[PDB]
Design a protein around this ligand. Structure first.
Ligand SMILES: O=C(Nc1cccc(S(=O)(=O)N2CCN(c3ccccn3)CC2)c1)Nc1nccs1
Ligand SMILES: O=C(Nc1cccc(S(=O)(=O)N2CCN(c3ccccn3)CC2)c1)Nc1nccs1
Ligand SMILES: [Zn+2]
Ligand SMILES: [Zn+2]
Lengths: 313, 270, 159, 270
């Protein structure tokens, strides 16, 4: 007979927080044009340490059936690169993929490895196309960052981004990604050599420790009140070591703006030897009455913190 | 070549610190978030989610919920009537009564009905002529108020965290008997006391109680066989509590500066 | 005492197909930059028939509290237009909203109306912007169609 | 002006028939779709979803599932061993054994474990050295095979439609007793017979049966008190059946011409 068990201890069935976030995150990556990939965990012993940033033992099988599938994976990128190489060879030029999957790091002999869940993906081709209108937006580095920014937004996480040098990557178009003073991944264009080996045009990858991401407890959304009156916007113009991260400007500015700095934007750059950074500051106070005197006091303390960590105008 | 591709390399260097090309995310309405959260809690307990009419018959709005034609509730002054007999619904209970009757007197019933509701009132920062309810209804055969209490506890944890407790205070609604008004332990102050909870450490979030015999019977269920519990809550109120939202009208005004704060996931925190 | 009821007839709790599709669809509209709106069902009697394509009776309240809120809605667009007007006046120039909500059509006198669930939205401003790169893609008609194409794709429907 | 804005009107006419600016949608993997479908079925019945290690100890892969050190199952030839004692897992049951033991001998247990699994084999169109399983495990106090049967019926309907029936055939697995192999009525031919079902009208989709006493006891549960049912299925196989996918390797090759066919919702049809 067909029956169903009646449980006497009642619990509501739900995804864990991590499980729920992961459904949501996949949704937002799919919402942005990225296809979900599933790649093989096992790589060639030669490639097992490709893109790994900590040096760490790899895990080989006693008896592989294939030299293609001999060693566990310390990165998702080798097979996602392969997969992009393969699509491109078949005249599928627009490739956009992401994967959430384990990588494997030896805890030495007789010991289970660390299995760490990564989030990575790879992008090449057009992001936006409508030929008849003359619309063609080619994937570049900042599109790839946009993807990674959008992951951070959805998850309510604060990522920072400093220039970097990695392995398979264009050394002047690579960045390390940090969360809470921990490095957790990177984004970058593939080295022009590695592209060329794989018959690939401009291509970008990102790779992230999803386990690190998932450790940040973000709580409930922090709502701010809606302002009943306007804020104030001022655009400053700087001159820098053409050579300095915009991130460093944003950081002091935001270190000096107290209560009432709402947001900033670098909206223009020029470069011999120095660069101009135009940045738009948005002051606002949804809480108390904003005054011109506080906004000039703070403004000018901003432009002074800037001068002293080394900035003209 | 290892000259030329090498100094192509360098003409191609970028500040990776600059603004990404945003791929913007739209927001989920705060009111929808609360409703779906509560959908998810109850799907996982075997319940269905039901929708019904926003414009309803006065029999289902009132008569079937134990409000005879006399009753003050039915004042033309406090509900948006369209004829004598037809009006904007005041609660989502009509849906639950229409649903019960269809079951001709066999359980279980276990339903959750969220939706828009309507009240003849003037609008300010705490009052809206259109707002939202979620109700539910369980009808089965040895259903107890202990069972309504455990259900409320899960609801309160769902909304306001695993550590929440509840308090039940006696009260009165015509469609239930016994009736309760339900508080959640304040999620801000442990239980010292604060602005949020009016320094009592308890915040009222729900009403509920046992379905009233007459309500069961007008719908065809046998009150000697079947008991029943039901409950209501108001996402507008819940979400103003949870977030410190200052004005109920902000839900229906669609300032993007309000809406766009609600892009991101949340967790149990720490 | 705190207990939970044990149901003896067991059924798995799930969204209906329509319910499920609706969660999924909202997800895909949010994934494309559209904010979920909720507007007031009640409009001014003057506007109640705005954008309606079948001629059909409107439903008025016996006793409105406001002339703003006198008649049910045969379209979502009046209040979404209002809402865009309001944002724009507050210097929120990029407005992207969608709503899934009922509209109301009289079946004449003493009869419950037809309550029909619509999907609408409204768009103005930039769709894609990165100023420092000189990227600015302004919303046009084909962007708006792209949204509607994307709704058809996700739902597996041919429009 | 009613000249000039009027002939602006006309210089602004467009073919509305032209291609929209696509806002492209990425695809959900077919294998993930099946897993999540099944997650959703069982969340709604009160179960949890559990993940475990892909590289596992031979005690949990084997010993705890009633495969003593002798047993042919443990051949170095058919599993990817890393040492004598450590190997790529062959099934998701290690997770379920590790989970039971942690419960020190109190129920319920009701879990669903999906994941990647590994087999020492050569790859072709029907064989993959890496593929996917979902198992589950219910342990409680008067758990019957009628209860496993009703659960399988829901699974089969979930996957292949409300009209599906199942068939249970006797079989043998070391970790269960009684054991069954489970067919679903063919979803294509009513029950005439077809290519899809090898003209028998039944398609094998699952195995299952009562958890074996030794398996319960090695994990600490008392087999005089507690019974148990468990089951496995393979999304790779399910999804090749459901869609007519011609090559298991297509799941792990990530041709976008394969992936991008799986953008859209589905329904119960008609
Ligand atoms: O019984 C209910 N629901 C119910 C039970 C108690 C409390 C509330 S509540 O707090 O939201 N409520 C809303 C309505 N309020 C009213 C309405 C009219 C008269 C008095 N008071 C009181 C507070 C809802 N519905 C059923 N459907 C079918 C059968 S029983
Ligand atoms: O008991 C199970 N699962 C189970 C029950 C029956 C059938 C299958 S199945 O069809 O997928 N299987 C997969 C493995 N196969 C094997 C494996 C080794 C030896 C023989 N045959 C048979 C088919 C799975 N797991 C438990 N975890 C904890 C306690 S019990
Ligand atoms: Zn308090
Ligand atoms: Zn057949």
């Amino acid at each position: 007979p067909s029956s169903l068990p009646v449980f006497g201890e009642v619990t509501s069935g739900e995804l864990t927080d991590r499980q729920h976030k992961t459904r949501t995150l996949k949704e937002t990556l799919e919402g942005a044009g990225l296809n979900q990939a599933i790649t093989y965990s096992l790589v060639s012993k030669d490639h097992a340490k490709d893109f790994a940033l900590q040096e760490r033992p790899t895990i080989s099988l006693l008896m592989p059936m294939s030299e293609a599938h001999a060693t566990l994976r310390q990165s998702l990128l080798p097979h996602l690169i392969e997969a992009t190489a393969y699509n491109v060879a078949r005249k599928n030029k627009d490739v956009r993929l992401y994967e959430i999957g384990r990588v494997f790091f030896g805890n030495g002999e007789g010991e289970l490895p660390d299995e760490v869940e990564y989030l990575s993906g790879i992008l090449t081709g057009e992001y936006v196309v409508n030929a008849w209108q003359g619309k063609k937006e080619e994937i570049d580095f900042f599109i790839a960052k946009g993807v990674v920014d959008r992951v951070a937004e959805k998850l309510n996480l604060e990522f920072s981004y400093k220039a970097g040098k990695i392995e398979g990557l264009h050394p002047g178009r690579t960045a390390i990604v940090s969360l809470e003073g921990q490095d957790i991944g990177f984004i970058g264009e593939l080295h022009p050599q590695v592209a060329a080996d794989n018959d690939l045009k401009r291509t970008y990858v990102f790779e992230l420790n999803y386990d690190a991401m998932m450790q940040v407890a973000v709580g409930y959304i922090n709502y701010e009140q809606i302002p009943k009156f306007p804020g104030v916007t001022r655009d400053i113009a700087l001159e820098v070591n053409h050579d300095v991260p915009s991130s460093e400007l944003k950081q002091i500015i935001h270190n000096n703006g107290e209560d009432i700095l709402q947001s900033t934007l670098v909206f223009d750059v020029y470069e011999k030897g120095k660069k101009s950074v135009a940045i738009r500051l948005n002051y606002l106070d949804t809480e108390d009455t904003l005054t011109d005197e506080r906004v000039s006091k703070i403004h000018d303390k901003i432009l002074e913190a800037l001068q002293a960590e080394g900035a003209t105008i | 070549l290892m000259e030329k591709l090498n100094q192509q390399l360098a003409e191609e260097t970028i500040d990776v610190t600059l603004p990404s090309r945003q791929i913007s995310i739209g927001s989920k309405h705060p009111l929808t978030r609360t409703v779906e959260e509560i959908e998810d809690l109850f799907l996982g307990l075997g319940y269905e989610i039901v929708d019904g009419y926003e414009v309803e018959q006065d029999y289902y709005n009132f008569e079937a919920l134990n409000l005879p034609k006399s009753h003050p509730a039915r004042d033309m002054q406090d509900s948006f009537y369209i004829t004598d007999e037809i009006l904007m619904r005041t609660h989502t209970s009509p849906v639950q009564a229409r649903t019960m009757e269809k079951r001709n007197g066999q359980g279980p019933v276990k339903i959750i009905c969220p939706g828009k509701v309507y009240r003849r009132d003037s609008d300010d920062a705490t009052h809206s002529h259109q707002f939202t309810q979620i109700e539910g209804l369980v009808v089965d055969k040895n259903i107890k108020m202990s069972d309504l209490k455990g259900t409320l506890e899960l609801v309160a944890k769902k909304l306001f965290g695993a550590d929440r407790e509840i308090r039940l205070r006696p009260s009165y609604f015509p469609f239930t008997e016994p009736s309760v008004e339900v508080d959640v332990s304040c999620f801000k102050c442990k239980g010292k006391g604060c602005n949020v909870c009016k320094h009592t450490g308890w915040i009222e979030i729900l009403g509920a109680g046992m379905v009233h015999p007459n309500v069961l019977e007008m719908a065809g269920f046998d009150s000697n066989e079947y008991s029943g519990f039901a409950f209501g809550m108001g996402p507008d109120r819940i979400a103003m509590l949870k977030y410190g939202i200052e004005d109920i009208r902000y839900f229906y005004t669609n300032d993007v500066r309000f809406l766009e704060q609600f892009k991101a996931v949340e967790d149990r925190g720490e």
